[PDB]
Write a protein that binds this ligand. Sequence first.
Ligand SMILES: Cc1cc2nc3c(=O)[nH]c(=O)nc-3n(C[C@H](O)[C@H](O)[C@H](O)COP(=O)(O)OP(=O)(O)OC[C@H]3O[C@@H](n4cnc5c(N)ncnc54)[C@H](O)[C@@H]3O)c2cc1C
Ligand SMILES: Cc1cc2nc3c(=O)[nH]c(=O)nc-3n(C[C@H](O)[C@H](O)[C@H](O)COP(=O)(O)OP(=O)(O)OC[C@H]3O[C@@H](n4cnc5c(N)ncnc54)[C@H](O)[C@@H]3O)c2cc1C
Ligand code: FES
Ligand code: FES
Lengths: 315, 315, 96, 96
Amino acid sequence: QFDFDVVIVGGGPAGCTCALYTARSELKTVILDKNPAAGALAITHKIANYPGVPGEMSGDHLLEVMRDQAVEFGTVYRRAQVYGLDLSEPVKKVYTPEGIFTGRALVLATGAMGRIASIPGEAEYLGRGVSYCATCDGAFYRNREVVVVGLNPEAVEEAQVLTKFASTVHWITPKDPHTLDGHADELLAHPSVKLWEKTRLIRIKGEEAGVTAVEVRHPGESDSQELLAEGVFVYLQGSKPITDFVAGQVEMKPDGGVWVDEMMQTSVPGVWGIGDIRNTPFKQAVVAAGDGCIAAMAIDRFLNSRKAIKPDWAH
Amino acid sequence: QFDFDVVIVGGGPAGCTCALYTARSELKTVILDKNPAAGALAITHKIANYPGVPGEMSGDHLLEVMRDQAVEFGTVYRRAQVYGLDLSEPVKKVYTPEGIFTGRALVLATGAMGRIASIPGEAEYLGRGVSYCATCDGAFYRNREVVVVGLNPEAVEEAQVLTKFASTVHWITPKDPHTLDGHADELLAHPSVKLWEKTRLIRIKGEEAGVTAVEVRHPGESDSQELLAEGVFVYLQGSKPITDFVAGQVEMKPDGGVWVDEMMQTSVPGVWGIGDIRNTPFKQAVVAAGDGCIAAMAIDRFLNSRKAIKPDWAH
Amino acid sequence: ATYKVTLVTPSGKKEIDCPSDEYILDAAERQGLDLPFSCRAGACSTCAGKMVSGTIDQGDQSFLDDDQIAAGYVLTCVAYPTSNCSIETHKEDELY
Amino acid sequence: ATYKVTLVTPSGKKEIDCPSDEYILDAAERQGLDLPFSCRAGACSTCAGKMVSGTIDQGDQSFLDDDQIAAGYVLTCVAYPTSNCSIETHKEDELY
Ligand SMILES: Cc1cc2nc3c(=O)[nH]c(=O)nc-3n(C[C@H](O)[C@H](O)[C@H](O)COP(=O)(O)OP(=O)(O)OC[C@H]3O[C@@H](n4cnc5c(N)ncnc54)[C@H](O)[C@@H]3O)c2cc1C
Ligand SMILES: Cc1cc2nc3c(=O)[nH]c(=O)nc-3n(C[C@H](O)[C@H](O)[C@H](O)COP(=O)(O)OP(=O)(O)OC[C@H]3O[C@@H](n4cnc5c(N)ncnc54)[C@H](O)[C@@H]3O)c2cc1C
Ligand code: FES
Ligand code: FES
């Protein structure tokens, strides 16, 4: 349930492929996946350049097939957002709200859907009202006012989490939620949710204790509105490797991606990095999947103390 | 998206419970819910006699739990007002502004918060300027003057819809709308809206072509004021089963509720009726929920051609 | 026109002012009285009262039948005074 | 406020209306045009266009540098019109 041979953080094509191979090597494997709908491949509406997969195929259907493959061979798939890591000892510790997972090998596979803090006050009030994990921090906003920024499946799922604690969930979207064709109708039917459609969060403000309010504005208008709030959860999609939860414990190439050697291993022994978290220019699904298999096979050699890399053929 | 095994019209406790059970039967199920805030349970500020639910509980937070339950087991919840039905063939067609939904089984679960036409000219000019569905008729009032009657969340949301088309939205309220405590602030900021607070609609007027004006009067004043209008949207709360959208296609009891047999099925095979739309004297939430469960299990027997009713017990 | 409304509550009598264009319940609350309500829309009878004296207008009412109206019962959340009047509150149990 | 946006596509020009609080791409699709997109979030350059006339607001953008913006390039998926404006579509390949 919590102690594994392999812990994989992130369930995109990189992580699902790594797990496929480690599970086939009869290594006890877990994928900790924040949100299956939030990875780059998952949000591709059509993919026509994945070799071996012809015709009309949506990215989230393709990911589902790979996830199902990994699970068919024994992977434990868990919905769990990783908020931190302890890499100090040979057994790696992976902190989530669902509990602490341990692995003899750890794979970082979180992709590059991350955004640098963009909004005035966002960087300034992080850890003081500004948060990127509702399952981590939601309980602290029982009977308090909170703000969710973003229109994407992560924002919708995290807002649902916060409706079990907050007084009011202010939802700020740049488009009307009608734009997800009903995918947000349950959320919007919740009596706690106030929808601020086609508005932008231009500033987050507070005191030293933390956030007290936000400034919101309709694009093209001169008038702003202040909303009192104590929690601001920002779920905007970007271009950047998701690495802040690693808290600088692995070395980064200047580009901001995770540095790795020929065999996908980071600067920390026992820790691998695969897929778009590495921030190479070759952001394609089959490349990501390839990284994951390389790491899986280096991991199998490491964890079974083999004298050479073992090919996985004929079955 | 639009073709379902089960289409449920109305997302009160009857419909949400029916969906809970049909979705668990792995029937593809949709709830079409006009407005989650407009059902009887949704508007009770306190419910203390729902068995299994102790302590302080508001009706809309109880319904939210039921709705989320139905969705956790696979129900599609869609906010959509049904304005008509085609019950002529084995696949039932359900007309909404969001599109036409199809079901092999149809469940009528719209409750009894309806007010039979109360205002002189309301019945007379129905379909000729008088309407109860802004998402269905709003586009035909582009650059025309319209009237909204009522102070409740439905009236507010429907008036917002109409501000996207109308020249002017005359809003008639019996009291000041800040009483709905911020829910009406956006509406009232719209430059199309004229608020006629503490006024009463005496009469709807017109010609053969349709509505041309309303007569309104401040209580106690004794002299009336005429406002020209071509559309009148009436959103008042009452005691009667919401059945007009069925257009007489299922049999009604003399009391006006939908007739059903012991398994909650109407006069029309493949069509069920549950909850307060039936207009029994036993208007309580757990009774409504019970109807929905019965119908779900009769539906499962029907749609999978079972030999007997199959219970849904824990495995 | 403002009318004097005497409400006969379980806690004793209290006189209020109610403009002819304000609902009894809203006037009473504004003047510090806590009276029973649920829908506040004329769609239940949680707020039921009974006319001791005077008259009201409950045309916005939509839950009481003709026998109940003819017995002096009223939904105070949608009743306008049309005279100086007296109303017993907390009368729901008598409707049934 | 709604601004007239003329899109200069490979098939010729087409005029649309875009509210000040609607993205160019969303307005164009709503008006029957198929223009290129991937992320729809300002995080790639699939939707790249380039300004001929007028002004836009692409503050939600996060992928183009200042030299590219100063050359008239724009991500149409997160651009609001701030005037009536002209935009060449399908301009991604010029960035590479
Ligand atoms: C719009 C778009 C279109 C694309 N189209 C194509 C195309 O047509 N063809 C092609 O070859 N490539 C395409 N790509 C590129 C391709 O999607 C990526 O190269 C690939 O998905 C990267 O895989 P990944 O597994 O490294 O990351 P991702 O696919 O982004 O997956 C990352 C996973 O990590 C999870 N995660 C993130 N943070 C955490 C955390 N803290 N804890 C736990 N889990 C976490 C996420 O929920 C997600 O499941 C496209 C990309 C985008 C953005
Ligand atoms: C003021 C009040 C207080 C009450 N208090 C209690 C209490 O304390 N305890 C108790 O046990 N019972 C109580 N009840 C009764 C209980 O709420 C009802 O019996 C129960 O809610 C009926 O459930 P239903 O699903 O049949 O209808 P509803 O709860 O009314 O739900 C009907 C649903 O259908 C939707 N709908 C309507 N028309 C359409 C359409 N055309 N298209 C799509 N959707 C549509 C509505 O928006 C709504 O979501 C109360 C009722 C009222 C009015
Ligand atoms: S409070 Fe419901 S009818 Fe008066
Ligand atoms: S579609 Fe990616 S930036 Fe516009």
